[PDB]
Amino acid sequence: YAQWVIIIIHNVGSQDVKIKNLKASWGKLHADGDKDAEVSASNYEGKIVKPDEKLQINASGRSDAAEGTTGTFDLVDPADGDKQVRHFYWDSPWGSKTNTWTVSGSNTKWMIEYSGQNLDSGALGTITVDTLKKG
Protein backbone atom coordinates (compact mmCIF):
# COMPACT_ATOMS: atom_id res chain seq x y z
CA TYR A 1 0.00 0.00 0.00
CA ALA A 2 3.09 2.21 0.02
CA GLN A 3 2.51 2.58 -3.74
CA TRP A 4 -0.58 4.67 -4.38
CA VAL A 5 -2.00 7.49 -6.43
CA ILE A 6 -5.03 9.75 -6.12
CA ILE A 7 -6.07 11.40 -9.39
CA ILE A 8 -8.49 14.31 -9.10
CA ILE A 9 -10.04 15.51 -12.35
CA HIS A 10 -11.29 19.08 -11.86
CA ASN A 11 -13.34 20.59 -14.68
CA VAL A 12 -12.41 24.27 -14.49
CA GLY A 13 -14.07 25.19 -17.79
CA SER A 14 -17.66 25.61 -18.91
CA GLN A 15 -18.14 22.39 -20.92
CA ASP A 16 -18.55 18.80 -19.74
CA VAL A 17 -15.68 16.33 -20.05
CA LYS A 18 -16.03 12.54 -19.94
CA ILE A 19 -13.83 9.68 -18.71
CA LYS A 20 -13.55 6.36 -20.54
CA ASN A 21 -11.38 3.26 -20.55
CA LEU A 22 -10.14 3.44 -16.97
CA LYS A 23 -8.08 0.32 -16.34
CA ALA A 24 -5.53 -0.65 -13.71
CA SER A 25 -2.97 -3.11 -15.09
CA TRP A 26 -1.29 -3.52 -11.67
CA GLY A 27 -2.83 -3.05 -8.27
CA LYS A 28 -6.42 -2.08 -7.54
CA LEU A 29 -8.81 0.82 -7.71
CA HIS A 30 -10.46 1.69 -4.41
CA ALA A 31 -12.86 4.04 -2.69
CA ASP A 32 -11.90 7.45 -1.31
CA GLY A 33 -9.80 7.01 1.82
CA ASP A 34 -10.55 3.29 1.87
CA LYS A 35 -7.91 1.04 0.27
CA ASP A 36 -9.76 -2.08 1.47
CA ALA A 37 -12.95 -1.06 -0.38
CA GLU A 38 -12.17 -2.01 -3.98
CA VAL A 39 -14.18 -0.37 -6.74
CA SER A 40 -14.84 -1.39 -10.32
CA ALA A 41 -13.50 0.63 -13.20
CA SER A 42 -17.03 0.40 -14.64
CA ASN A 43 -18.24 2.90 -12.04
CA TYR A 44 -16.19 5.44 -13.99
CA GLU A 45 -16.94 4.36 -17.57
CA GLY A 46 -18.58 7.23 -19.35
CA LYS A 47 -18.82 9.40 -16.24
CA ILE A 48 -19.28 13.09 -16.97
CA VAL A 49 -17.40 15.73 -14.98
CA LYS A 50 -19.54 18.88 -15.18
CA PRO A 51 -18.19 22.41 -14.81
CA ASP A 52 -16.56 22.98 -11.40
CA GLU A 53 -17.02 19.32 -10.42
CA LYS A 54 -14.26 16.97 -9.38
CA LEU A 55 -13.96 13.24 -10.00
CA GLN A 56 -11.54 11.27 -7.80
CA ILE A 57 -9.77 8.01 -8.74
CA ASN A 58 -7.79 6.14 -6.06
CA ALA A 59 -5.37 3.36 -7.00
CA SER A 60 -2.98 1.39 -4.86
CA GLY A 61 -0.74 -1.60 -4.87
CA ARG A 62 -1.79 -4.95 -3.49
CA SER A 63 -2.12 -5.72 0.21
CA ASP A 64 -0.49 -9.17 -0.09
CA ALA A 65 2.03 -8.81 -2.93
CA ALA A 66 5.07 -6.75 -3.88
CA GLU A 67 3.03 -5.09 -6.64
CA GLY A 68 2.63 -1.36 -7.28
CA THR A 69 -0.11 0.50 -9.12
CA THR A 70 -0.19 1.09 -12.89
CA GLY A 71 -3.04 2.22 -15.09
CA THR A 72 -4.51 4.25 -17.92
CA PHE A 73 -7.59 6.22 -18.83
CA ASP A 74 -8.87 8.62 -21.48
CA LEU A 75 -10.71 11.89 -21.31
CA VAL A 76 -13.10 12.52 -24.21
CA ASP A 77 -15.36 15.35 -25.34
CA PRO A 78 -19.05 14.39 -25.10
CA ALA A 79 -20.13 17.41 -27.16
CA ASP A 80 -17.94 16.24 -30.07
CA GLY A 81 -19.01 12.59 -30.34
CA ASP A 82 -16.68 11.50 -27.51
CA LYS A 83 -13.69 12.81 -29.43
CA GLN A 84 -10.45 11.97 -27.66
CA VAL A 85 -9.08 14.77 -25.46
CA ARG A 86 -6.01 13.20 -23.82
CA HIS A 87 -4.70 9.78 -22.78
CA PHE A 88 -3.29 9.26 -19.27
CA TYR A 89 -0.82 6.71 -17.90
CA TRP A 90 0.37 6.24 -14.32
CA ASP A 91 2.98 3.95 -12.82
CA SER A 92 4.01 3.79 -9.15
CA PRO A 93 6.05 0.59 -9.14
CA TRP A 94 7.04 -1.46 -6.16
CA GLY A 95 10.67 -0.87 -5.37
CA SER A 96 13.35 1.53 -6.51
CA LYS A 97 12.00 2.33 -9.98
CA THR A 98 11.00 5.99 -10.27
CA ASN A 99 7.35 6.80 -10.86
CA THR A 100 5.81 7.85 -14.17
CA TRP A 101 2.85 10.11 -14.95
CA THR A 102 2.32 10.71 -18.68
CA VAL A 103 -0.36 12.76 -20.43
CA SER A 104 -0.49 12.45 -24.20
CA GLY A 105 -2.55 13.41 -27.22
CA SER A 106 -3.66 16.37 -29.25
CA ASN A 107 -7.01 18.07 -29.10
CA THR A 108 -6.48 21.80 -29.46
CA LYS A 109 -9.99 22.63 -28.27
CA TRP A 110 -8.89 21.58 -24.77
CA MET A 111 -6.34 22.73 -22.23
CA ILE A 112 -5.14 20.24 -19.63
CA GLU A 113 -2.94 21.17 -16.63
CA TYR A 114 -1.65 18.76 -13.99
CA SER A 115 0.44 18.93 -10.84
CA GLY A 116 1.23 17.06 -7.62
CA GLN A 117 2.98 13.99 -9.01
CA ASN A 118 5.96 12.65 -7.08
CA LEU A 119 8.43 11.30 -9.65
CA ASP A 120 11.02 10.08 -7.16
CA SER A 121 10.99 7.10 -4.82
CA GLY A 122 7.76 6.44 -3.00
CA ALA A 123 4.13 6.91 -3.85
CA LEU A 124 3.10 8.85 -6.91
CA GLY A 125 0.83 10.86 -4.59
CA THR A 126 -2.10 13.16 -5.34
CA ILE A 127 -2.27 14.42 -8.92
CA THR A 128 -4.78 17.11 -9.83
CA VAL A 129 -5.79 17.40 -13.49
CA ASP A 130 -7.56 20.63 -14.44
CA THR A 131 -9.54 20.49 -17.69
CA LEU A 132 -10.83 23.40 -19.76
CA LYS A 133 -12.45 23.51 -23.17
CA LYS A 134 -11.17 26.65 -24.90
CA GLY A 135 -13.66 29.18 -26.20
Other CB atoms within 10 Å distance of the CB of residue 89: 14
CB of 22 or CB of 124, closer to Na ion: 124
Q: Nearer to Na ion by C-beta: 15 or 69?
A: 69
C-beta of residue 55 within 8 angstroms of C-beta of residue 19: yes
Q: Which of 53, 17, 22 is nearest to 39 (CA)?
A: 22
Q: Which is nearer to Na ion, 27 or 93 (CB)?
A: 93
CB of residue 55 to Na ion, shortest distance in Å = 24
Q: How far is the CB of 124 from Na ion (least distance, A)?
A: 7
Minimum distance, C-beta of residue 99 to Na ion, in the bound complex (Å): 5
SS3 of 23-39:
EEEECEEEECCEEEEEC
Nearer to Na ion, 99 or 117 (CB): 99
Q: Restricting to residues 90-129, which ones interact with Na ion according to CB under 5 A? A: 92-93, 99
User: Between 65 and 94, how does the x/- string for binding to Na ion read (CB under 5 A)?
Assistant: ---------------------------xx-
Q: Which residues are at the interface with Na ion (CB under 5 A)?
A: 92-93, 99
